[model samples]
Target: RDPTFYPSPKMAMKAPPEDLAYVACLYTGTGINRADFIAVVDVNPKSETYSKIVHKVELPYINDELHHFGWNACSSALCPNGKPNIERRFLIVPGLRSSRIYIIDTKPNPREPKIIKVIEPEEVKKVSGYSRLHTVHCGPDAIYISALGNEEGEGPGGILMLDHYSFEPLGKWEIDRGDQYLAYDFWWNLPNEVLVSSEWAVPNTIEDGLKLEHLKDRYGNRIHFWDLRKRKRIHSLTLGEENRMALELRPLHDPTKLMGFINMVVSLKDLSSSIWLWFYEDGKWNAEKVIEIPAEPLEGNLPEILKPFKAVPPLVTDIDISLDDKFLYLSLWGIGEVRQYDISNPFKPVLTGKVKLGGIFHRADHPAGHKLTGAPQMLEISRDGRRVYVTNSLYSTWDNQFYPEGLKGWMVKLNANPSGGLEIDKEFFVDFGEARSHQVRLSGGDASSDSYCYP
Candidate 1:
């Protein structure tokens, strides 16, 4: 087994602090005139280039629109029947729009990652009959990625597998997908053999930015549960007819807990956002909405989508749980706030802290004395859960529809208190020159980067 691969979440926590981070930088609709790239940033406080983009690996093709990506293997490799001697190295990065996959090697030199293999869109669609790759997770034996749609940008989107060594497309992972037509993010509890997945809409409806008309019936409003080893759907739950676009899925880090959090992007009833806790109980899985944030009525200057409502939606696009399973951080992109909650009790979450930076109505300036543009969207936390890193870009077309004036890409770090509360680290800011930023993965393993087999 690899030295960096720990058997349990608690064991992984005692590893050394992450010294680097690989952030996905996008230039899709920003008019940056450059390809999307991965910005290698120095996270070590002791490093001379701390908080700076130490290096960059630009993709050969344009409009890759890099989103949620992960390591080729993680602590999950320690699972039974899991491949042995697999290092937590290669990053399987997929282009959301192009349907291309970039296999990046971070071993020879951590700071300067190199792309060793590029899986073309044709091969992806041919092998799996899926496109619009959304999220990536390294399973025990292979790489698993959630695809949003088929070649024609239509329904029946599900998970796909990739070979561990060859990095080749291994076709779809679903032996039976059930009624799960839409997909966004997926995570699992290895011990219970339960895999949970959330849904977003098809490519056509979301590609041109959110269409208000799609809220009622077009966008996804359900969550699906699957038997991890069986490769089939076991159960499904519709969060609510009003709760649309169930996006981020964060399962509790501790394998014994059997519960996790998922965020709903918006509620058609009130333009609000919510968080739900799903757990296995009484021999079946059940979920309950535990947190909700209503839209704030702004006087004016609302996005076209919200002009009639005259309010700013919470737009909880992303949520991450700490490795210790004590805190949940939410990125309120539209409201320009990163809110942290104490999830000591899975049923109820206490809002312990929040920080506002930028949004449509309130473009709050950063404490670092920089004029901020985009709000915190993608979030990544350190293994120890002491540091939280956030990027401001959500998506290309959506960025323009909401911000309108344009989103100037920026990344910032938040110092998290052990007990509760969060403070923006004033000195740490990475100004993405011509590109907008999205999902970030810490060099070794962050909170959302790995899954554990032992409690």
Candidate 2:
């Protein structure tokens, strides 16, 4: 039997019944063969056993040609509520090639699922190119999808909004061209607001001529703020010097502030990378403080022992706040670790615990295995906040040439604690075996045509 299929013993917990946990996985296979899977797991805290997979659901007729298998849900009071309605369901936007949005009603058993409806990309294309929808999120009364390009090809990208209940097209908000990869990953700031990051591009000719290093940073980083009601961009801020990878808008649980907070992974030139926290207060976005790992003590006369990993900088792929909003859980994919911070003091985030988990290297030898071959990308926490589930896989593309051996693609369950370290309660792995065939063709060619096709 597959190790991932083996069920682990359930643990005890004091949390309410609504606190149980579940994870949705977007599995990417060879050319247009992708699939969506949901593993119903146990995440109660009182039990000695932390977390384990109890159920799973795999969608049918999934198009694998799409590169990034991204999906999200609107279970809270935010989604459309109607009879036979989908209160807790999965909203998936298959990437690149598919150009379609799917709402899989998981009200049924996760293992045996059914597709409620498919929203064609053309329905929303009136706003922009709608070629590649990266992220799907639900707000107060609308469902927003981020497109990679604009309708006129004049800007980097824009966002499309639809009625959460009717799935009817609302309107579009065009951002600056420099914000090309906008909305790749974003979170709601308020019931009607959001913040998104922009990815800039650099020309290969200039990089070659200058022999430039770290050419990836040529375009720089910027963050945009939008108001859903106004259907326009309200503010934009440039992250100078210390910024990389993706940006997120994290709001504390407090609603009295009328505005939430903004946080990002910033890379520094000389010092270690850190998480920069900012907040929207007094009708403006205020810059808070920078939080990072303290450096080791060293003398100037002698070389330091075990210097840190060259301070490559931090790439915060995903973040989740504790239910009480006391702690901020962040996954740094660049370092293959998850770190929790005490966010009680929004300006001063203190690292509580760290866990070195699995990554691309773990499943390098298991080409035939079903494991993730890259860093963990998504992190979802159970409702009660005692259990945390993590998914490991590349975000938005399937070019696995570097780690040819492939990585184990699976979800790992951990005990969510105030001390902030991941104790792996259990894990479920999956590999579609789609890449193996591609490797075989490259290694073994047609012998009949190689030497005498036309001789």
Q: What's each prediction's TM-score?
A: 0.99, 0.68
How well is each residue in 64-181 modelled by candidate 1, as lDDT tens digits? 8888789999999999878977888899999999899999999789999999999999999999999999899988979999988988999788899999989999999999888889
Per-residue lDDT tens digits of candidate 2, residues 1-455? 11111011111012233323334444453343556544444444464433444445454545422322222323223212312332334534344334566565544454334567776667656534554555555443456666554443223555666665666566664533333444444444343344444343222212122222443454335566656445556676655455543344555544333333333444444323345565677778655445653322332321121133333233455666664566777765544566677777676777886665643222222222433445545565543455555655543232243233444445555566855555555333333333211000000001000100000
Candidate 2 Cα errors over 4 Å, as ranges: 1-86, 89-92, 108-111, 126-128, 151-154, 173-181, 191-220, 258-273, 293-314, 359-373, 396-404, 419-421, 426-455
Q: What lDDT does each candidate get? A: 0.90, 0.44
Candidate with top TM-score is: 1
